[PDB]
Design a protein around this ligand. Structure first.
Ligand SMILES: [Ca+2]
Length: 212
């Protein structure tokens, strides 16, 4: 039986959330649908993977950090082990998210979050992100992957521009306007007051961009 834990964070004066996640291996799932700042359920089969949470409010910014203890490691055998983080985030508070993911699968619905910035690094694995919200300010998204696939869902209603670069692999961007070298946009870009600027880099793997 793996360990299971719930963690709940109240804002305690924060007016912005800065979420910083360091995740070595496994499955990370993020959504909205939380009343407090964040609620998470963490499942881990190895005691060494026990997540470490730090939260402080500095000058109205709630700095929330969640880290899987590094295994500096030689080998880890993954069969029959489990490491899963399932996180629910507040939908109203202005939010920046930074993720460093070693290996595994990252899935996030951020369409209901008051998102300002997202930075994702992934070593080996998959990223699937719904950032198709009607955001009420400009949004900056940076995604960088080593080996694996990244899929991003973007809104039709606000302007989007994506710079998508791969080493070896394909950019699948049907229904987007193609601009010169590695730039993709929707029809709203340049027209809506608000926009999402997206940079996506993949070493080896596919980049799939879709409107939703
Ligand atoms: Ca870099």
């Amino acid at each position: 039986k793996p360990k299971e834990e719930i963690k709940i964070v109240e804002p305690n004066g924060a007016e912005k959330t800065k979420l910083n996640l360091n995740f070595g291996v496994g499955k990370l799932n993020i959504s909205g649908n939380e009343e407090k700042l964040m609620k998470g359920k963490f499942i881990y089969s190895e005691n060494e993977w026990k997540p470490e949470i730090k939260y402080e409010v500095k000058d109205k910014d709630g700095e929330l950090e969640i880290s899987q203890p590094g295994l500096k490691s030689g080998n880890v055998s993954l069969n029959n082990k489990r490491n899963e983080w399932n996180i629910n985030l507040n939908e109203k508070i202005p939010t920046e998210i930074k993720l460093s993911l070693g290996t595994g699968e990252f899935k996030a619905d951020l369409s209901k979050i008051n998102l300002k910035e997202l930075n994702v690094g992934m070593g080996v694995g998959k990223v699937d992100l719904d950032i198709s919200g009607n955001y009420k300010n400009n949004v900056k998204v940076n995604i960088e992957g080593g080996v694996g696939e990244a899929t991003v869902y973007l809104p039709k209603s606000i302007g989007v521009k994506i710079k998508a670069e791969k080493g070896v692999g394909a950019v699948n961007a049907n229904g987007f306007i193609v601009e010169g070298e590695n730039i993709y946009k929707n029809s709203q870009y340049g027209k809506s007051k608000n926009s999402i600027e997206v940079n996506i880099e993949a070493g080896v793997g596919a980049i799939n961009i879709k409107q939703k």
